[PDB]
RNA sequence: GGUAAAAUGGCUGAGAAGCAUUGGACUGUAAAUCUAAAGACAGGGGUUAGGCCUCUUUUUACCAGCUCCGAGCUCG
């Protein structure tokens, strides 16, 4: 199309536009109708090229650089040890559910961010001393989330020690032992219960539409809870919704006998001054 | 130069709203003809007042400066350092007169740019003021017309865009047609190629438009010139939320909640016209009123349908109409305080005249407003706070118009009010526009129980009031709200007694005076939570009003003057008995409806379930914060 | 050689117990399948041919095993080999502090009765059956082969009852071998690892795949044909007695 | 040191349990004697002082062990050590061809449930009590010590049920230690071998005298005080877990 | 099976290795005898047929084993099985208080060099030879079988050096199997008891034969060869010690 | 009690041997450190007081061990306990197909010449010294304690020479215990797991934390004071002989 | 319902950059590495020369307006 002409002319002006471009992202560019969307998309491409080029120079700068008990094969041993722990957790661990029913309310950017947060959350859960048993409920096959997950994990997807299913959490656990964590719940989480199942909505929701998780929970008459962020720290600025990795790390700290003043260490410091 | 500039019609000239524009720009904002109720309309449609630098008034008349005080106190609470007015030179005297009932309004700064003052230019627009004097210091024959010229914007090479000018013309009557036609300054822009005026806003009665001279005057501006006409011929709903609420409540009880009522382009609400980007009749936000959607939304409520079904399967004069049941600021659903009393089919009494009261009355009665104004016998003003008396001049002018239309003699109205109100109306009559020739005012102190006849004229006036309203006796007492704050009580020959408290606190003189009242109307500004604030602000809480009513032993109790904190409904404490009721805008209450009123509580709870739940949640959060403090 | 031998295989209607029956019948031996009546033992017996007879019996019951042995003696005339492949398992931790759960005594007792008690019952009755056999020219009267998973040496979490039963079998292997030495009966034990039997399929698929991948060589689940091959090797070899052979793949099971 | 510790000793009214109780009470600890009502444990509890109490219970029944643990918690408010020195023993060959005798299933069942099932019952019920203790500086919550004679490794003729029970105890030690590792409870096993308990004294005097000569060094029957010393050493050492220790004096049993 | 399969058998001139060679060649395999030049294994290699070749070598010497493996590669082209059946034995008490005699360090070291060091020396080279084989469809490249007597568990009086070497082999089995697992080589160990080797063959031998529970006789190298063949055939045996004993547990 | 005992500790200038010497001297015994001259054991002997004497000797050569024993007899007059806590560790694969690398024979030989041959040399020379002692009232003349490793049971990739040497000690601990039984000398073996010796604490922090997490309970590296405590318990107990004790924490080595 | 300020979806920034994350490597003890993936400062709009201007959402503060002149509780 004619978009390449304005691309080159803005590159001559250097108005925060990518140095080069590929065909597929170019078609995505003409699939942007607002000049603001095209400007934001071009800036995203521009910052991608800059960071990719900037990090390359670090390789060049690095290029300027008996009796033993064990061979230096530590990475394999850590991986195998985490695998054994995960295999045991898949049988005797406490279930934790990620609800993938929010695939409709997320745009492409929020979908990619959700996948990244899910990757980080699973990685943090694997390394723990007492991991959960992570469930991926309402994960429709060949869906957008499923396709992205199998793209990022590649062949590891078939070997991850977690249960992925197309069913719902209500179809796997008794309705009494299910607690749907959400920021809009009226009930305030007091203590971590080891006999309950906690559901975390795999949601990003940058274009804030609060109450989605609460509506989904109340539709099935499920119990709801909210973190006592307020009771333990001075909330200054920022929405009380937390990322998936922060939520799983808070739950892991609580699960391991930690107190609230220690579990809330993973809340970003830019949101609260300090504890009470 | 700014990148976008467009106009917007806040009010379309309808008899109940007046006319007003709203010039929006990236650098400045302007307003024209701030009439009564303009603040409420602009707040409802989310029109920001943060950077309202200038307000242009095209004529020194209450239809153009009615809501000026409300806008001034709002901009102040907004934090604007200075606001500049433009129009007739009489504004200075008007500003002096406003301070009589208000304070000195020290915070905000007021400036006046009369027509004789040098031209004013801004970062986005140059404004010229054209003084026009009708054929044949108070001046009743001056009208100011505005010609606004935009700044030339250099092109992006893109050719530059020359400034496009628009003209606002006010022609209140036929007497102004020739001065407009013979004006030389208009011929400078009209008969030329200089920036052919993009759009001309005409605010003149339709009888003026059909005149041949005026028709030729508009045609001489060129073929490309548009013409917008706000001429009381508009058919558009201005208060959408009020219509929604009234239609929804009408589904419960129809009687208690009655239903409301040369090329040229007739103005509509929220109609726009861009000038800087391009020149088009945008028309993207035009309000659309459809009762079917409103009743569908009401019926789909979780509990409304069963509640109204249960109420319905269960199954005269005087009648009270609550025109306005809100305290300080006009809001989306509740206007400022007012109460119409219909003693007889031929006589009526207005219990309080807030700002824009006539607008609510016109909306309530529709084409019957002229007949209603004929029956208006007296108006009672209780304490000189703003938004309790500012709507009086509109009522007086509309009463004169209705009497002229209906063919009745102009007999002066009877006003019972504190003597301090005399100074405000006296200054307005002397400096700005003749009013006093319409009222015969009676001081409120002269009607006290222990009062004495100050003058024989006062005794004659009060006797005339008793004859006209057919009342047996009229009494007033000093309630404990502010300096010179009065209640009232009316007793008819039939024997029923009505008592109006007014802004007050729990008082003993009111209880003593209003003993054995048939119906009591009491202030209910706050709830039990903020009794300390109520004492500090000299107001009564809900339980305080209920206790006052019970002690006085009234047959029924009604509450009004709800605070801005309250959005739609007040709380319904278990103390709510069969005698305690609640008030909403535009409901009609008769003496036979007292048993019905308690039965309406479940349907009203259902209709506002979400709002009351949100209010309860907010109160609980506030209580938790207070405890944790 | 195993030609002409008669074998009694407990649990020989599925898994490890069926592979040995298939191999022995194919080689030319006669087999008797000893399994619960609910299992489709009769279908496998019909499939294997005229040298296979299904005997519905319960190992935990003395009368049932006696009736099965009587049927085997009536049909074939002698008993030369006995293979104990019947065995159940349970997955339950001894005590779960966080969940406040305790291992039930009923589960432990049932696992102990099926795995350990039933094996001893079959051993002590089949030994009496072999005692009447005329001695082979090498002095051997019969062979008894047991099964005791590698959990006897390296238990996993939630594998207390299974490890206890298998460890009991392993510990009692040698005393029984010394007991039957005068009457010329050899007692041998096999310690299979992860062999992909219906017992192991109770675990989730991903756990099974990970466990298979962790075998040093070959990195796969065990094949019951390999178990049958080892069983035949034990029968043919006359000098294997009172020893536990781990058919594992060199896998050591982590906690 | 073991001062202030509270210990529950099953079978602590004679033999190795009584010796362990004597040594532990002597060092300043508190002991609870868990034995049968007719074992005469009340006399021993009275003799050992007010720091030792007797709780009549049967280890094979859940209710009796629960009542005994409740009594111990009421008296001392804490349980820190659980030592299992209980168990019957029988002696009969699996099959006696020359006499036509077959091992009875009742004797095997009785020895199995008293020795193996009772030990697991006590362990699972005690772990609930130890789980309520606050972890110490090292994170330890309690120590569980079991007994499993050397018959688990090298059994003799007639020790079929005994070897099965002891081998089951040995095999289940590692999975149980892995189960309670997150809790903070250490599990250990001891192989007493040949000791001067009344069980070994029930044999003919000549047989016992000959047996004491078969120990390489020291050439005498084991002293129960030595077993008590080993138990105390296991309690004191914080790094001993999931291991079987043979306190046999380098003896290896012959056919 | 073992048809067309090449095996390298250490100490094949006589003993358990000779019987293993006889059985393997009988079944259709190819054997390479690796023993001392004076052991007289050339006559046995000639007797067995054209599928047996005598390669004189000393297991303690790297050069001898390398030349023997080169000869095996030249003759047959590949190596698939390695059976380490060589070893010496010595009876001597650690200390005799009555006589004042002390076990000599040279005697102890000589046994370790042949039994333990020789086995590892053969293993580390035959594994390199086996690494060149194309993987079998089951993934297997070769099988290594070691011999370590039951002295590694219950040694007798005077068997200090012998038990040390055999226990070393038993302990070495598992880590070597883990080392060669990615390559695809199975390492297995056999623990023979009382066998009719030339070392063991009147009163003492008769009593020892009676001591075995069942069968009450000395072992048979034919049975040892049968067990070796079974280990070769079975694909799931790896990193384990098998005790071909007869249920005999030695006494002090 | 160990008051008055004289102990010879090989490799006692650092690691487990130093901790054993510190504990034994603290309880009132006397120790003779036996380690290479360049290990700086003279400073440790000076620190421990006049009750401890450094003997510069190499366990591989017979002459230095004899000289050290003569020095110990001259200084104190007798040898009652011998603790072998000296050894080198080497990690190297048997064969690396990708790199084309082979385990060199020199690395294998020098591990045996220290861990296995040196231990036996010290044992045989000390047993002569202990044979001159008058027998104790219990018939004992001395105690010899070796130090194997868990690598002798679960070797990892690369620990082929280490496991061969440590496996030899586990294999030979029983025949030696029978050899010295008439004299009255007890031989015992300890197999520590992951201990915080200086050779192992030099590893980076990340791998040290991983190794600490590997141990089930307590989830930390072993403390040499615990090894010294176990050595003292073995010395005091008269019925421990010819057995290997795993001081591990229930850690089974990962492959 | 209003008024004002702010908003980093892994965390801190700076206004570039660090600490992090995912897949792969059988590492000879700097793997303290190599390689592939993901890098969007609330969300929409516009324009724009950045940067502004606007709409929406969320977080945190805040929400009546009695004027006179002399008699000095009433008088205009
Ligand atoms: N403050 C908080 N308290 C409890 N759960 C929370 C939380 N913040 C996030 N979560 C959980 O983690 C998820 C992160 S996404 C949050 C957005 C969601 N639309 C909502 O506002 O409800 C949530 O869906 C919820 O499951
Ligand atoms: Zn008011
Ligand atoms: Zn008021």
GROMACS .gro file of N, CA, C and O in nm, chain B residues 215-216 218-219 227 262-264:
model
   32
  491UNK      N    1  -3.662   3.948   0.714
  491UNK     CA    2  -3.633   3.844   0.616
  491UNK      C    3  -3.530   3.890   0.514
  491UNK      O    4  -3.438   3.816   0.479
  492UNK      N    5  -3.545   4.014   0.465
  492UNK     CA    6  -3.445   4.069   0.374
  492UNK      C    7  -3.312   4.092   0.443
  492UNK      O    8  -3.206   4.080   0.380
  494UNK      N    9  -3.166   3.908   0.684
  494UNK     CA   10  -3.091   3.783   0.688
  494UNK      C   11  -3.042   3.744   0.549
  494UNK      O   12  -2.930   3.694   0.534
  495UNK      N   13  -3.125   3.766   0.446
  495UNK     CA   14  -3.088   3.722   0.312
  495UNK      C   15  -2.968   3.798   0.258
  495UNK      O   16  -2.894   3.746   0.173
  503UNK      N   17  -2.814   2.995   0.932
  503UNK     CA   18  -2.901   3.070   1.022
  503UNK      C   19  -2.960   2.975   1.125
  503UNK      O   20  -3.033   2.882   1.088
  538UNK      N   21  -3.636   3.173   0.299
  538UNK     CA   22  -3.499   3.178   0.348
  538UNK      C   23  -3.469   3.056   0.434
  538UNK      O   24  -3.543   3.025   0.527
  539UNK      N   25  -3.361   2.985   0.400
  539UNK     CA   26  -3.324   2.866   0.478
  539UNK      C   27  -3.297   2.900   0.623
  539UNK      O   28  -3.238   3.004   0.654
  540UNK      N   29  -3.341   2.812   0.712
  540UNK     CA   30  -3.327   2.834   0.855
  540UNK      C   31  -3.329   2.699   0.926
  540UNK      O   32  -3.391   2.604   0.878
   0.00000   0.00000   0.00000
